[PDB]
Amino acid sequence: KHPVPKKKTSKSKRDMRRSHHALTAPNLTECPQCHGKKLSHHICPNCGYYDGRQVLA
Amino acid sequence: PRAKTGIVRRRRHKKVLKRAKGFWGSRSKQYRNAFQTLLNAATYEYRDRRNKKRDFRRLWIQRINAGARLHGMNYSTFINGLKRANIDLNRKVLADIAAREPEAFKALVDASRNARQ
């Protein structure tokens, strides 16, 4: 029992591994009213608009 | 009095390390593995001075054989041909004639097959 790594992993390796941790930036749209930005199919967090006006102020 | 290391070890170290640029990974950044890599490098340097002298001869010979055979002659027969007619050329030079100057190499060929007759 008790596996353990045989050898330090190179800085190079370690970083090759990390080639996939890129965050994915939001696709962001600009609210058709109050004008800041929002997520598709969410309520625009600036005004509160989702066609008329749902969340409060 | 006491005498610390002060300054010497780091100078040695940087010496090795600075010999070692362009070495892959730790081989160029860690002292010990640098110094080590370098021992093996020693072997390779000395050896290959002799050995490159071995290698270039080879190359010349290849080219010579080629030219020889363009005009219907083997190399070996071409070289006894040259020694017979007491033409005394470097094979470095023979190669360069063979590669660079067609007609001239041709002339040496005819001279040599004459020396063979």
């Binding site: 997520l39 199919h41 969410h42 309520i43 967090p45 989702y50 749902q54 969340v55 | -």
Partner: protein, 113 residues
């Protein structure tokens, strides 16, 4: 695998006390804020309970009363809201995505009538 419903990392009793509490709450106050999922999972339980209350007879009250243990809310859903929904073939609710919370990263949401 056509199975249906959500485990919601809970035991059968919990799962039930959930849908009942959140039903009682949505009916107590027209709209509530909750995990997007718990919403998804709440919509059809409450919508149905509405359709039950839409019967008006005493049976349908006692029925609703098993799932909804607060008198005042029962009375509300029997006498006030079911009669309003009178003409709508279901779809008594809807869901809105508000979005990500700070503590635990979770898309909240809004569910209402």
């Amino acid at each position: 695998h056509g199975k249906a419903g959500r485990k919601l990392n809970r035991n059968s009793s919990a799962r039930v006390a959930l849908a009942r509490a959140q039903a009682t709450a949505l009916l107590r106050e027209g709209r509530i804020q909750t995990t997007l999922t718990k919403a998804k999972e709440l919509r059809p339980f409450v919508e149905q309970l509405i359709t039950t209350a839409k019967g008006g007879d005493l049976h349908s009250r006692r029925l609703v009363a098993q799932d909804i243990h607060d008198k005042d809310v029962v009375r509300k859903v029997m006498d006030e809201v079911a009669p309003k929904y009178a003409e709508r073939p279901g779809g008594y609710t809807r869901i809105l995505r508000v979005g990500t919370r700070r503590g635990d990263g979770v898309t909240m949401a809004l569910i209402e009538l």
